[PDB]
Design a protein around this ligand. Sequence first.
Ligand code: ATP
Ligand code: ADP
Ligand code: MG
Ligand code: MG
Lengths: 177, 210, 70, 281, 365, 52, 105, 52, 277
Amino acid sequence: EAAAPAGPKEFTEVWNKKAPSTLIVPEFPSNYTAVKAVGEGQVHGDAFPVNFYTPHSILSQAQKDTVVLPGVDGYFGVKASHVPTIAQLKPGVVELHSGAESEKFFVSGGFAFVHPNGVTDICVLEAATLDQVDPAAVKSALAAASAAQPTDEFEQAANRAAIELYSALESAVEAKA
Amino acid sequence: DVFYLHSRLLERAAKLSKELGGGSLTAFPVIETQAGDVSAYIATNVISITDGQIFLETELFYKGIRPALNVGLSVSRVGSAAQFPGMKQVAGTLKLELAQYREVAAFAQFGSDLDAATQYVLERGARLTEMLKQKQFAPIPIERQTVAVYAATKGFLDKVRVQDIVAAEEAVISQVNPAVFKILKANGKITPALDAHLKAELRKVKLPGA
Amino acid sequence: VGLSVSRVGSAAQFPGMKQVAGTLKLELAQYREVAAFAQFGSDLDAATQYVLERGARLTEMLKQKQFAPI
Amino acid sequence: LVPIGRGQRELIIGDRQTGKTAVAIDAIIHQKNCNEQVPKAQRVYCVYVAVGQKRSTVAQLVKLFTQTGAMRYTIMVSATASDAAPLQFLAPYSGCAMAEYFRDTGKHGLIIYDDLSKQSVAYRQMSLLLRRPPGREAFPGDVFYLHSRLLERAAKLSKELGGGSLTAFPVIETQAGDVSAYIATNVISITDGQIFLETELFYKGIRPALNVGLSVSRVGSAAQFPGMKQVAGTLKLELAQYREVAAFAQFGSDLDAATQYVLERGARLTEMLKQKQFAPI
Amino acid sequence: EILVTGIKVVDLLAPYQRGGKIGLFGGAGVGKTVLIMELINNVAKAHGGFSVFAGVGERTREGNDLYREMIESGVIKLGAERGNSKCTLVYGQMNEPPGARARVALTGLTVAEYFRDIEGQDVLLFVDNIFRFTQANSEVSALLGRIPSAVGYQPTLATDLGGLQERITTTTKGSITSVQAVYVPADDLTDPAPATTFAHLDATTVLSRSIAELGIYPAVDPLDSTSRMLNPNVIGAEHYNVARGVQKVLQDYKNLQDIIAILGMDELSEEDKLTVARARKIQRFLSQPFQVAEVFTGTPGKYVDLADTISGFQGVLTGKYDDLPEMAFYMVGDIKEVKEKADKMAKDIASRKEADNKKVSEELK
Amino acid sequence: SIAELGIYPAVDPLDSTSRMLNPNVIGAEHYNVARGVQKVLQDYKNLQDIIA
Amino acid sequence: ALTGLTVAEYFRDIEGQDVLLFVDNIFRFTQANSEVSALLGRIPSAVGYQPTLATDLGGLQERITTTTKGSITSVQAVYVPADDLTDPAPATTFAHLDATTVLSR
Amino acid sequence: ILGMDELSEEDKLTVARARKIQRFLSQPFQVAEVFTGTPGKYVDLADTISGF
Amino acid sequence: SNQAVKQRIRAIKNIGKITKAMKMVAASKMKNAQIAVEQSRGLVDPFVRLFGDFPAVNSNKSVVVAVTSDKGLCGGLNSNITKYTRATLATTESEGKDVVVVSIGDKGRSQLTRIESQRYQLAIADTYKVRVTFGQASLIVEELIKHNPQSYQILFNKFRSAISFKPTVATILSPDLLEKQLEDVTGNSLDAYDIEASHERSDVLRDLTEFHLGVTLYNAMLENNCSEHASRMSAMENSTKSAGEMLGKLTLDYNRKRQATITTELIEIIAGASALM
Ligand SMILES: Nc1ncnc2c1ncn2[C@@H]1O[C@H](COP(=O)(O)OP(=O)(O)OP(=O)(O)O)[C@@H](O)[C@H]1O
Ligand SMILES: Nc1ncnc2c1ncn2[C@@H]1O[C@H](COP(=O)(O)OP(=O)(O)O)[C@@H](O)[C@H]1O
Ligand SMILES: [Mg+2]
Ligand SMILES: [Mg+2]
């Protein structure tokens, strides 16, 4: 079950046997991140590091005290020494609390990993804050998505994704403080 | 007849035969050049008359390499195989390590990629260029000049970076035993007896780059 | 404008014109190295653009029709 | 590309060893091949005037003309480099007088003045030693008249005067492709066409090294083969499209892939116009 | 018929004719005296006839060098064996007044013409700087009351030179193989004394200054040197197609050098990179060491036969030697020796040091 | 250069100058078309440095 | 410019001073001496200056020196024709010049 | 091209040292003080070397 | 021949201002693409600490992607990773595996065919024309999962600074075709995590490595595009020097010809006058 002892350090030593000796080793994405998963530490009691990302932005990388994540089973919350978790998220609201103050991003879906060292790594595609969403045109397209269901089995899923996104978006503009 | 002006003049610089006394006269014409243009009229006339050239580059003179001897263009074919036998041993490597230094610096002066073999050449080439630059109105005897290039084409100077090589030379030529200049002068060349004696004196000189 | 000089200079300028043409010749001087880069309009630097557009505002100002002096 | 009618003076200009004689020799050799097939009235009798050349170079040409058989129609008027400067100045006019026998009696001539540029240097020698005051590059004033007197004798006569013709091929050597020289600019103004031969085209493989964008025939397609007047107009235009698309792909910036078709076909066409020496088609 | 010189760029691209006129064109320090002493070394010993060296307006030191080196070569024999000499020297060198330098080429031909006409045999005439004949008449012509011609020369330049050069020929009774050095003034090949000489020669070997500054010796311009022997009916089609193919890639490389200077080789097509790789290789392969230049370069000189020249450049054109680096081709004899030198280059990059001790440098032995 | 491209008559449109090219001589709808055509041909020559 | 030398040479040789001499545009000295050679029927040299260009300059510039009495120091303005430093009028002038002061905009 | 605070602190140490050398080569002139107000400064040679 | 040298100073002076315009065109494009390459660097970090980094695996099938530029005044950037392609495409083959070579960028199809033309199967170009987006990098990834390999190789230049561009190999294993098969040593490295998906762990890893493919592809063609502008900037600096060194040699050559034609026209005038006087 351990046929290939791979890794970044192993690739350097074997690549000096097949490539020319002029070329130095290519870099690897492990050489650019300092935070690991199994590396012990990185909790520091109350506030744990939350890396809330998008493809186009780094929306948070400082530490928070709790993260309300919109998992596909339901909304769960993460405290500091949470269990290791690979959580696929629904379209829902990621709530980043620091204490008394909390910032509420509505995300489109996309995973969230809690690593064994207590590092939370939320990984979504479009993460809009609810301040820049308007509650008018959400049901203007949801009423259209509640009407147009043909026998296209590819649009069977794409309309299902259209309905469940706006429906969670309907319910998460109503309860704002 | 401006060619004949100079050709009938410089032809009088000759080495006479032994029935005429064996006397000699060696000439150094000086030609000033406009903007480095060696293909001017009077410049190319005197190149066709004289036996070699000492080209003095303006760009090497602005970098502080003085005497600014353009090594790739300066020739002396009549004077070679008439030079110091000790200097002829050590300058064949000096002309060659400068021949590679110009050839390697022709390839990549800006940092595309630096080989470890070519950065030996730029480390040895900048060593020998700082070796050859000397200051004015203090000419060096040929035995102090052979030893100083012996200390540079070989090892004995790779410790100093590039800066204290001028100070390493008087660190070399004053700290070696001054008898080693007397045997090299009187033999003319570096005997194998003096060869490893001079390796021995060049290991007990204290170099300023440490 | 780069080659046309006046060794008398602005000591025989109309004052009032001397107030405003002193910065006209400067804004056109900066424009002249920035000119012939104006074919890069899709590719822009936005401070190089301000001297580029104002430099074209001023050369279009100095045009005249003949036999009607101002 | 640059076709030549009967009674037209055409310049062969180029640098040294670019093939100017080879264009001229192949015109002479080809007339022998054509004179065996035509009736007696339209046969071209060549005259080759060799001004200021080596005598060995001339003896190599009469050896080639005897071996090809072209010597039956060729007069070889030779003013070599050891001849007096009035013999080389006067040799174009003496060869043109021999060639004008055929023009004046209803037959067709072909005169080749190989290095009119060497005639002008021999005419400059006599002018400067007769103390005529010099002009540009020490040439006399009337050196335009030296060559326009000679080249205007190449004519196509009326049918009242026999209908004979004389076709001239002056040869001019330039120095570094410098057609702006004094004698070269005089003869470009005199002659009708111009066959400019290039050095960098010669070594690229394209020989006869004809600069197709600089080579003119002022008579044009009025006096060319009708079987090529309809074919080479396509060839003249496709080579004109070949030139600018080869200037940009010299850099290697981008490809249009529709200008790559005209770069492919004109490369066949440039390769089509190549020819071996001493084998006229 | 061809004259094999043992020089690669000569025998390939501009081959010399055995009874013809040969000109070496040069610009003050580019190497036309080393080349003309190499032709004395290669051609003039296997020729079997008499030689005449007319030194016209060159260095007197070089006249003493050739005279002394011919005595130790046995070409000149002194004393009672003088009749077994093969060379006669006529010297009008650059200390002479301009009347002596204007006529010493004529007395060098008269010695060569006697062996051609009366003795009826094959002569080698080597004229060092036939330009100095033209220049000495130009010093004189100002004082003969003549209006000067273009750049400042005599009005009679072409006929003065023509009357001398037309005597240097092969006739039906004997042969003169004439090699003449031609100086070009201020590196200007459009100067009327070089420009007039070009018509008088069967083979012109033009030596360039930029070729010499790249370290290539003999500094022959491959795209400016020309022979009349480069003809497929004279040298054969295998020789001719290699010479024309060598010139074609060197010309297309010259067309690229404007872009390679500005944009670099990174912007080339890889079809064009194969041109630059091959044309840099044959540019180095055209150079060779000389047996007369070993006394100042250290490298022993290589006579390369014509068959080894043709096959060697044909391999680089077809692509058989794209493996080897471009410095393996530099200053080597034939294609056997670029493989001998490439092996050494590879071997050296491995073994460079570990000479600490237990050599002969012990302080007591 | 106009003749080498095949435009015949090979008139340099910028270098050709007339004294009838005043607006009070040929009118404004001939003068502005001529000054407009010359402006587009002059701009193209300043871009043809960067196109080529 | 020789009238300017002679006034400065009195202060050097009789008054014994360290004199400044300003030859405003030494090129126009060259240019004027080149005209008087052309009017005297002399054949012009390379690019078109007088044949005596180095001795028309050197006759002036060698009177500007330090003697045992005093000194003349010359600050002379240099025009470079066609922005060509290898032109024979600045090239002959720059053989005499011991310093340059370049004023820039 | 890149920025002021882009490059190193030593390359900024030269820029701070050069800019107060480039300023310190200025000097008010005694003949210019009748129209500039600033008095003139004759600066001796030893004070120039030791100042720089 | 004094106009041929004057029209070359026409050429080199226009080139030396074209190439200085392209130097600062690429310099401003390097800075506004650095604000996109730093934001995108975050999302590649969780997938390399969840799935690790395993370049040298014995995959049965591989898709190797060398992402290059579209325009080519880059200065040997598109060739250095074509060189680094076969440096990793000969290295990781220890058993004779299938490899599909892909190139993003129009300068990749012209250089990967020169090495592997029998394994080159896809050509993505016209990528950087408007901008690089994740939906675009998703579609490029979905065309790469039509072929299903056991591993993916992405070859790109990591934009480190404006000077250094160290190239990267970023590897993505197929979800259990090798991915869990490399974690399961004396247990599993992935079994620490409690899966909160809808379906199985083998099914969420199918979702999770396509998302890991699209993320490290979006970063690759955004790291490479900002590495392209910063090598065109160093290339167009080296060509304005080369067009200033050439312009300086031409002006020395022009001044020599300018002086020589003034001497030549004057000697012609005096000779004609001395012949009359
Ligand atoms: N069409 C051709 N194909 C192949 N070789 C050619 C061709 N034309 C000429 N050559 C070769 O090129 C050399 C130069 O040719 P040619 O003698 O005709 O040039 P030229 O213009 O007469 O030169 P010059 O009169 O200056 O010596 C000749 O040796 C000839 O063998
Ligand atoms: N074939 C060669 N090999 C090595 N060096 C050469 C060669 N030809 C010329 N040189 C160098 O160039 C110089 C040119 O000298 P020479 O041949 O006498 O020049 P010229 O052409 O002016 O007579 C020589 O002294 C030599 O240093
Ligand atoms: Mg000819
Ligand atoms: Mg010589």
